[PDB]
Amino acid sequence: GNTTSSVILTNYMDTQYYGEIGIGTPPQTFKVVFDTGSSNVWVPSSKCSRLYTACVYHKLFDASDSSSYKHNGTELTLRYSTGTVSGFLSQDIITVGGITVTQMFGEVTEMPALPFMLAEFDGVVGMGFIEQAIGRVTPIFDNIISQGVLKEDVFSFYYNRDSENSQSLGGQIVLGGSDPQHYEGNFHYINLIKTGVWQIQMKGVSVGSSTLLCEDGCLALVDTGASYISGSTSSIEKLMEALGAKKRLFDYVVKCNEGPTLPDISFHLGGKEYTLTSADYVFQESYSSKKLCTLAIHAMDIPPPTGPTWALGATFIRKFYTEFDRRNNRIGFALAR
């Protein structure tokens, strides 16, 4: 086949990026995060009790309204480190761009307020591999590949910084290729450590010209579902000490005046420096010496086998257009625009 296919994302405040998918006949539409850190598709279910406020606020899939729905009912429990969701397996046709595919997905009936009452999206489309898929359900991109409609077995992500203009594209995922409007130059390719997770070795992370963390090597998950860049508690503590940043309940902060003069942070990837400046990684709500500004970075201890490991999320992806390549088990990075 010869399909490239694009899906427009809305950017909520530079921490959530989601697009629309349609499930069923006729399609019930859902806002979903496309998460290379996970491999299951789920949406909240019309069987989810209104005891879960997340099921009052979000859109719900009603199977009995879909003529292509096929019952399964097997339990599914997705125990993310942030919060477990539970429900049951269902099968139906899922539209993503112009691409239609019969997919097994979770109908979610338990959805905790932390974190789901903070979510502007309803559901998740896991773009990881079957090796991370709970209950061994074939992931949506695998079923898309089997169709043999795509140009290349690749998909790609553009995340934009949030802008005022109702005309601004929040972001874009391309299935089957990448979109040259959204990056400059050529891709630098980095081989996966292994098939099964979107993860690469990293040689180092430099604060200023000094490669002070990860000096003897570490892992990086390129994780389009992570809002911030994250590293292990021990790494992040050292990084933050290096910036002079203070830990609060939910973020790290610097006085907003001090932001622009913080040193660059560079991630040494496939033998190149991926550099974020303090313009890339500090939310500068202002430049007041009396105000504190959040860094788009925190500590998240990912448990083995995936961790310990950094996650290069939206903070990183905004600068670097990211191509996830299934045929060659590699990730390409180019400079976004």
Ligand X SMILES: CNC[C@H](CC1CCCCC1)NC(=O)N1CCC[C@@H]([C@@](O)(CCCNC(C)=O)c2cccc(Cl)c2)C1
Ligand Y SMILES: *[C@@H]1O[C@H](CO)[C@@H](O[C@@H]2O[C@H](CO)[C@@H](O)[C@H](O)[C@H]2NC(C)=O)[C@H](O)[C@H]1NC(C)=O
Ligand Z SMILES: *[C@@H]1O[C@H](CO)[C@@H](O)[C@H](O)[C@H]1NC(C)=O
116 binds ligand X (CB under 6 A): yes
Which range binds a second copy by CB under 8 A, 93-101, 109-117, 165-173, 206-214?
109-117
131/198 Cα distance (integer angstroms): 11
20 binds ligand X (CB under 6 A): no
User: Please, are residues 111 and 54 in contact by the beta-carbon 8 Å criterion?
Assistant: yes
Binding mask 68-107 for ligand Y (x = CB under 6 A): ---xxxx---------------------------------
The catalytic site residues sit at 35, 223
Judged by CB under 8 A, the residue of 8, 118, 279, 335 near a second copy is 118
Q: Could you say which residues in the range 275-304 bind a second copy, by CB under 8 A?
A: 300-301, 303
259 binds, among ligand Z, ligand X, ligand Y, none (CB under 5 to 8 A by kind): none
Place of tokens 């990075």: 333
248 binds a second copy (CB under 8 A): yes
278 C-beta neighbours (distance < 10 Å), count = 19
270/274 Cα distance (integer angstroms): 10
- When the beta carbons of 72 and 211 are compared against ligand Y, the nearer one is 72
- Give how far Cα 194 sits from Cα of 83, 221, 232, 304, Å: 27, 12, 21, 15
Please name which of 243, 280, 283 lies closest in space to residue 262, comparing C-alpha atoms: 243
Phi, psi angles (nearest 5°) of residue 318 = -55, -40
Please name which of 199, 38, 193 lies closest in space to residue 131, comparing C-alpha atoms: 38
114 binds ligand X (CB under 6 A): yes
51 binds ligand X (CB under 6 A): no
110 binds ligand X (CB under 6 A): no
- When the beta carbons of 2 and 289 are compared against a second copy, the nearer one is 289
74 binds ligand Z (CB under 6 A): yes
Place of tokens 């970075």: 297
Rounded to 5°, angle at Cα 223 from 250 and 75 = 90
Please name which of 100, 153, 102 lies closest in space to residue 129, comparing C-alpha atoms: 153
Residues at the contact surface with ligand X, assessed by CB under 6 A: 13-18, 33, 35, 37-38, 80-83, 114-116, 118-119, 124, 223, 225-228, 230, 249-251, 283, 294, 298, 300, 313-314
Residues at the contact surface with a second copy, assessed by CB under 8 A: 53, 57, 81-83, 113-114, 117-118, 233, 246-250, 300-301, 303
